[PDB]
Subunit: 268 residues, 3 copies
């Protein structure tokens, strides 16, 4: 019920003052709040990438967090901002364009409102920056003691726009999944294949990558990077419980380029 | 009370330098909240830093110390100044024009040169007045040091100011220039204000003058979503000035333009 | 007490990973102030991380927990350690040399291996000891957990140390090397200390660069020469440096860490 920590994500970058003006607005409304960036380097307009970056935020952040996020190419239109309380007791504020989808998969919506009250907005609201004047402003009002019900009208959880998320499946003689995202600092590849599907099969595994070119590798299944020699490839379960590909102390995607959506098949 | 420090520089955030400044500030003012504006000002680029600070006074609350340095004159006779503005904020930075546009937004009421050793981090290193004078003095002010204790009062006329172009009426339209690029998205921002373009009462001709002329016929829109994806628009930005963009694409990647380029807007 | 956490890693700040670590830390130590040092250490580059931490003890106050990981050994027998230094700061990181130069600045007084499950984020994921051991333990120390509760005491000599080259006197000058590039500006930082160049000044010096001879003025600061002109100076860390006034020295004279620099009188 206290929410003194604001965790802030956007696609505006941190190379100029724009992300910081939003923090200025938030500190003016909630001067005692702690404000921490998640990241401002979501690719421009990339709601799905934003959604992926928020997926694990509910689990890592404590109950007293307001998750404040915008990737908002619909700014100044009928696409409203929503404010949600999740099952962990956190509050989330963002555009109703699918941005909060994967965060809500981790901790479901309990109470959901559209943000329509002028008193939780930064006035006058500029049409090209709902991110500052509605999303950041409303997050700060919630951190400063405003009740969730005062932001605007209640909506049903099914009125929250959801992005589709592919599930891995069993096929003839293995598991077909896909690349969800690249761990870009390192070049590791993250799939949607969970622990339980590869249990049957665990060793040394055939991995088929369908990208610009189709590549078959025979890879050891390891707990961590150091279990093969430097520069050598491995399969492992990542910090999110999903199958991943890497090179020990090198960059897997620089050797075998792959993009999100590319098929990965794992077979004995 | 000024317990919020908003911090700008050109040292980047890719190494420890900007953080050592925060270490010095926390040692002086251990209760202060410190928030970055940005550290990605182009190296030595006082004017770009000044532009990035222009809207900081408006967005940040009255209890802010704006701490900023882009200081190629470090270790020379170019002094640091501390200013109280009409909003009641404090500003600290080199007297080299860096605070010019912030002071245009909220004028100086009181100005001092920072000369007292007791508000500096001793011994002061000649190549980093940003840490040992600007950051240190901002933190002393945040810890409750009176502005008068930093050094002698100076006339606000002795604050170095940067020139800026004004838009004006010409034969059949308004001639301004490109002030900056919204680089995360590729949007173009001009100095042409709302009040001059009273003549949306009715598509407009925009003439961009560089090494070549780019003449476009553009719709005047409230926001990005009012044209199809990839299509160009003219709009009033978050600062109340004419801007150019592509809906969910990058305007300057299609039509390169740089700051200083002339822009005329006229009836078609 | 240690209510300020200063946080470094190699995971970048372009995605949520560094922020999930801060979430874990705020959950353990909700009153803590958390400030990044940087997350842009080059991947797996323990030496670059160690150099970026060198000046942190001196600039940060005694109530700081220095939380740092560059941990390609995650999920192996390479343990995390927690140290109290002579300034009274706490430091947490992998025992892989990362803390070496921070400890040169302010030596270890008490050192423990981090083995207690009660200072870790459970369950500990093998590929992210940085989050589940290093960040979690830093936050428990910031919340007032005694250092002795993290795990068993070790001798200071069991802390892995990275070698660091010393400049020396040779026939008619000083032989040092490039330690790092001040990359925002292109300035070159050497391992030559203030005291070795004091001996040598009459204020013009000759520099021989690895893989060029320059005759350079020794200046207090950049603005003592015209814009675009080269200078020698003592940097903010008390070491000899090379720069161009309002330009990029390494873009004109490329030099990499480990390249020899010899300084001799005119
Ligand atoms: N040219 C453009 N087209 C569409 N949307 C744009 C834009 N420039 C910024 N934004 C969008 O403006 C939002 C602030 Cl509310 C950001 O999250 C960004 O997605
Ligand atoms: N090579 C160089 N020439 C002139 N100024 C320089 C420099 N390297 C860093 N600074 C300047 O040192 C300041 C710290 Cl006080 C920064 O703001 C930066 O502008
Ligand atoms: N492909 C890879 N090889 C070796 N180590 C890797 C890696 N990807 C991430 N890390 C390492 O995982 C640590 C988190 Cl504990 C980071 O500090 C990073 O150094």
């Amino acid at each position: 019920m206290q929410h003194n920590l604001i965790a802030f994500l956007s696609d505006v970058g941190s190379a100029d003052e724009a992300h910081a003006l939003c923090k200025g607005v938030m500190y003016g409304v909630a001067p005692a709040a702690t404000i921490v960036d998640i990241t401002h380097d979501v690719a421009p307009f990339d709601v799905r990438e934003g959604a992926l970056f928020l997926a694990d935020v509910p689990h890592s952040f404590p109950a007293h967090t307001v998750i404040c996020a915008y990737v908002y190419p619909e700014t100044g239109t009928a696409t409203h901002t929503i404010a949600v309380r999740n099952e962990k007791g956190q509050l989330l504020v963002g555009p109703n364009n699918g941005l909060l989808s994967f965060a809500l998969d981790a901790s479901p919506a309990v109470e959901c409102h559209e943000v329509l009250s002028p008193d939780v907005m930064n006035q006058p609201v500029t049409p090209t920056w709902y991110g500052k004047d509605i999303v950041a402003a409303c997050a700060a009002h919630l951190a400063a003691g405003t009740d969730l019900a005062a932001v605007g009208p209640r909506i049903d959880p099914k009125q929250i726009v959801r992005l589709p998320y592919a599930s891995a499946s069993e096929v003839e003689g293995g598991i077909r999944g896909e690349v969800v995202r690249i761990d870009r600092a390192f070049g590791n590849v993250w799939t949607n294949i969970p622990t339980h599907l590869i249990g049957s099969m665990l060793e040394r595994l055939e991995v088929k990558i369908e990208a610009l070119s189709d590549t078959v590798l025979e890879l050891p299944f390891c707990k961590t990077f150091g279990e093969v020699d430097e520069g050598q490839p491995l399969l492992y379960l990542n910090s999110r419980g999903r199958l991943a590909l890497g090179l020990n102390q090198s960059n897997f995607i620089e050797k075998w380029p792959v993009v999100p959506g590319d098929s990965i098949t794992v077979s004995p």
